Amino acid sequence: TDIYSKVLVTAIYLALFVVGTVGNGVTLFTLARLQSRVDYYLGSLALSDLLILLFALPVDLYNFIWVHHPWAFGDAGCKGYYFLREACTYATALNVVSLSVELYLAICHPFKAKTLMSRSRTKKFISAIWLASALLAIPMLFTMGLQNLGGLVCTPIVDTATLRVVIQLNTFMSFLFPMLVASILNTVAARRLTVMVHQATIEPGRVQALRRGVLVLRAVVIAFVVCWLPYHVRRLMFVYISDEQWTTALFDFYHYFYMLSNALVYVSAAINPILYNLAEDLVEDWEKARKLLEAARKGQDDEVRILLANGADVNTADETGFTPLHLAAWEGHLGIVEVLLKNGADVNANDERGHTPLHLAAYTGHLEIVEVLLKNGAGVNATDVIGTAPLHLAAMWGHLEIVEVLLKNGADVNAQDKFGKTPFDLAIDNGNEDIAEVLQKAATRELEVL
């Protein structure tokens, strides 16, 4: 009797329909063309959420919101509707949990993630989820059916006791237990993730990727719970409210509660593509980073420029804490080092061992890179865990030209390490007598000031 309510809902239903159908459609079309196991889950969700908007929404809108009396889809359409709706609630829920499980494993079992996780395994698993959802939905073919009360309505055809149990079961199996598992695992994953963040002078890329996964998956569960709790609460209310005590106050309440509860289920399907965006955006950033470290190590000068331009993180590191700049200098790719520092690479970055790019540049003995790094404000007197300054390494491996370069930029010749050895001492040890003379005079000059 409140027509505005129905009209307002129609607008929102159509809005969620037209966009949500197109959104999930495009997501499936896009995916059709290592971590391609993510895509399978996002494809699984897209499919489940598409089917709800395409088949469930329009039937719901027509024969539950507007036209109450005559059921326009017959006995098959009645049974099918409730089957395909329940199948898709299960699939979506089970997929969302599988997602939080895969993240949890990736975080809390890195060793297992490498071995256990495989494309073939995921394909077989997703097939089981859909099949599990389909089997658990069969009861809806027998529990729901047409009744005449012209007066043809898609109402339960079993006794309330039976109906209360099948739905009570579905609510546990396709929400409560799923969300329980998910929420817990995500919290355990969040607790475990903060351990690995505490290890940080490294800043690993894989950690940063997982860090984001937790944030995305936190949103997915909070989003799923708020969207699906009202729906499940209403269906539980309906089974226990099946007595003919329907006061006009209860009618009014349920009328709006039905509209709102179902609208949020369609919202949950219409936001599904946003998750795809958040996932692909996260995975692409992770992929760009790996490629940047690979290209920097490899020396693919052309690739580096591309990656940086598209938005690859210049200050990424591997498990050990080596940034692309670190590797570029180590492999002696002057052209790359110049590009990285141009795009804003951290000149004073350290690995686990405490080695700045300048350490590795001195070790190898690439004069041109050293001069570049120092121009960009490198730490001349930067020491590692052993206590080795770059001059120590330059002197030890006999790079007299680098030794002169460093001292020019204000290198401390008097610096010592854990073994107490100065660069001059390391030159004498290694037998770089020519370099030692340069350091010998350097120390004597400083004494003259005092």
Ligand X SMILES: COc1cccc(OC)c1-c1cc(C(=O)N[C@@H](CC(C)C)C(=O)O)nn1-c1ccnc2cc(Cl)ccc12
Q: Which CB sits closer to ligand X, 69 or 124? A: 69
- Per DSSP, the three-state class of 246 is coil
- Per DSSP, the three-state class of 104 is helix
Q: Which CB sits closer to ligand X, 55 or 397? A: 55
Q: Which CB sits closer to ligand X, 243 or 448? A: 243
Q: Which CB sits closer to ligand X, 40 or 238? A: 238
The values of phi and psi at residue 152, to 5°, are: -70, 115
Contact (Cβ atoms closer than 8 angstroms) between residue 112 and residue 118: no
Q: What is the DSSP string of 309-342?
A: HHT--SS-B-TT---HHHHHHHHT-HHHHHHHHH
| Smallest distance from ligand X to CB 324, Å | 55
| Smallest distance from ligand X to CB 95, Å | 21
Give 271's DSSP letter.
Answer: S
| Smallest distance from ligand X to CB 67, Å | 8
Which pairs count as long-range contacts for 304-307, CB under 8 Å and 24+ apart, including other chains?
A: 304/336, 304/339, 304/340, 305/339
Please report, for residues 13, 24, 242, 270, 450, the alpha-carbon distance to residue 19 in angstroms, rounded to integers and kept in the order given: 10, 9, 35, 7, 79
Point out the residue whose Cβ comes nearest to ligand X. 258
Contact (Cβ atoms closer than 8 angstroms) between residue 225 and residue 179: yes
> Strand 152-156 to strand 144-148: parallel, antiparallel, or no bridges (unpaired)?
antiparallel
Q: Which CB sits closer to ligand X, 155 or 381? A: 155
In whole angstroms, what is the distance from residue 372 CA to residue 379 CA? Answer: 12
| Smallest distance from ligand X to CB 153, Å | 4
Q: Which CB sits closer to ligand X, 143 or 356? A: 143
Q: How many CB atoms are located within 10 Å of the residue 65 CB? A: 18
Q: Which CB sits closer to ligand X, 28 or 153? A: 153
In whole angstroms, what is the distance from residue 50 CA to residue 27 CA? Answer: 10
Please count the residues of the chain. 450
Q: Which CB sits closer to ligand X, 36 or 155? A: 155
| Smallest distance from ligand X to CB 257, Å | 9
Q: Which CB sits closer to ligand X, 235 or 353? A: 235
| Smallest distance from ligand X to CB 213, Å | 33
| Smallest distance from ligand X to CB 142, Å | 12
| Smallest distance from ligand X to CB 88, Å | 13
Contact (Cβ atoms closer than 8 angstroms) between residue 272 and residue 46: yes
Estimate to the nearest angstrom the gap between the alpha carbon of 243 and the chain centroid.
47
Backbone region of residue 431 per phi and psi (left: phi > 0; alpha: psi in -120 to 50; beta: other values): left
The residues of the shown chain that bind ligand X, judged by CB under 6 A, are 64-65, 68, 153, 155, 167, 235, 238-239, 254-255, 258-259
| Smallest distance from ligand X to CB 135, Å | 18
Contact (Cβ atoms closer than 8 angstroms) between residue 423 and residue 415: yes
31, amino acid identity: L
Contact (Cβ atoms closer than 8 angstroms) between residue 423 and residue 414: no
| Smallest distance from ligand X to CB 169, Å | 12
Q: Which CB sits closer to ligand X, 47 or 259? A: 259
Q: How many CB atoms are located within 10 Å of the residue 364 CB? A: 16
